[PDB]
Amino acid sequence: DYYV
Amino acid sequence: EMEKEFEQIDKSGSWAAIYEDIRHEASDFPCRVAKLPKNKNRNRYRDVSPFDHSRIKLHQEDNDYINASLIKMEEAQRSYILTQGPLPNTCGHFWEMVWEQKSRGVVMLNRVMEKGSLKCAQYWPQKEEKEMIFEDTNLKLTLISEDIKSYYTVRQLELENLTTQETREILHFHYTTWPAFGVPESPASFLNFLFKVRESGSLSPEHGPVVVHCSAGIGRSGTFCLADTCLLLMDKRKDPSSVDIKKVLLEMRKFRMGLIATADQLRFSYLAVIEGAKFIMGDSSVQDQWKELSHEDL
C-alpha cells in the first residue's frame, strides 16, 4: 500500500 | 521546433536524468488534512496526498476531506481535478465532489483490476437497469447509454441530487489499454482519446473542471493533463516552439505531488505534444489520421  | 531538444535527449539517452531533475525541483507543500488519522481510510496510498492549499473540499459539515487536487493552469486557462481511484468507502465522496464542483466529464485512465491488483472501486453502474444509490451523500447514478471502442469506452451517465431532485448528465471517458507505470500504445491512440474528450465539451470553461483519475491520480493522470495543457499553451501563445514541457510540468506539480510517474511517461508527453502541434499548426486533418491510426473500431 505504498506508491513507490 | 522542440524536436531538437527531443532527438538531443534520445541520442543523449538522458531521459531518466531529466526525469529525476524534476523530482528534485518539484514543490513540497504541507499535506496536513490528508495526514489526519480520521482520514487514513480515505487515502488509497500512504505516500500520495493532496496539498492542503489545492485540495478539493466536500461541502459537508463533518468531514470535508477527499484525496483530490485542483490544478488551476492560469495561463492555459484550464482547471483540472486530479483524484485517486475511488475506494469502496469514497464512491459517494467522489460523486459528491463531481456534483459540488459542477464537473461535466470524468476521465478514467486505469482499469478496476490491473495485473491482479485492485486499483479502484466499481463506482459507476455497468447496467442500465442496476443504478447506484450513494446514501451517505444522497446521490443516484444511472447508466443511460455507452459507446464501446477498441481501447476506450465513452459512457453517458445521469447523476441525480436526491435532495433537490435536480439531474445532470456526466460523460465518462474510460481509457482501457494504458498500463500502470506504462504508456499508451501510440501518440495517435492518446491524441484521438484526448480530442474525443475535447470535442465532447466536457473541458469547456462554462463547466466545472473535468475530473481525471487513475490509481493514484498522479502518473497516467499527470501525462493526460500535461499534454492537454501544453497544446493549450501552444495555441494560446500562438507559437509551437515556445512551450517548455519541463516548465509546465513543474507548474502542475505546485498543485499535486508526483505528476508523471516514470521517465518513459515523460518521453511520451514530449512525443504526444510534438505530434499534436501538427493540429495546432493548422493541419486540422491530422485528427482524422489519428482516428484511423488508433484502430478505434474492432
Residue numbers in the entry:
A (entry chain D): 1160 to 1163
B (entry chain A): 2 to 299
Question: From the publication, what sentences describe this entry?
Answer:
Protein Tyrosine Phosphatase 1B (PTP1B) is the prototypical protein tyrosine phosphatase and plays an essential role in the regulation of several kinase-driven signalling pathways. Here we identify PTP1B as an inhibitor of IL-6 and show that, in vitro, it can dephosphorylate all four members of the JAK family. Dephosphorylation of substrate is initiated by nucleophilic attack by the active-site cysteine (Cys215) to form a phosphoenzyme intermediate followed by hydrolysis of the cysteinyl-phosphate to release free phosphate. Asp181 acts as both a proton donor, enabling protonation of the tyrosyl leaving group, and as a proton acceptor, receiving a proton from the water molecule that hydrolyzes the phosphoenzyme intermediate.
To determine the substrate-bound form of the D181A/Q262A double mutant we used the bisphosphorylated activation loop sequence of all four members of the JAK family as substrate peptides. Incorporation of the D181A/Q262A mutations leads to a five order-of-magnitude reduction in catalytic activity compared to WT PTP1B20. Nevertheless, in multiple co-substrate structures of this mutant, we observed that both steps of the reaction had occurred; dephosphorylation of the pTyr, presumably via the usual cysteinyl phosphate intermediate, as well as hydrolysis of that cysteinyl-phosphate. Surprisingly, the products of the phosphatase reaction (both the phosphate and the tyrosyl-peptide) were clearly visible in the active site in all four structures. The phosphate was not present as a cysteinyl-phosphate intermediate nor as the pTyr substrate but rather as free phosphate. This suggests that dephosphorylation had occurred within the crystal, as well as subsequent hydrolysis of the phosphoenzyme intermediate, but that neither the phosphate nor the tyrosyl-peptide product had completely diffused out of the active site. Accommodating both of these species within the active site necessitates a reorientation of both the tyrosine (back and across, towards solvent) and the phosphate (towards Q266, where it has displaced the water molecule W1 that Q266 coordinates) compared to previous structures. The occupancy of the phosphate was refined as ~60% suggesting that a proportion of it had left the active site but that the majority still remained. Our structure suggests that incorporation of the D181A/Q262A mutations have corrupted the usual catalytic cycle in which substrate is released prior to hydrolysis of the cysteine phosphate. In some of the JAK activation loop structures with the D181A/Q262A double mutant the register of the peptide in the active site is possibly scrambled, with populations of both the first and second tyrosines being present in the active site.
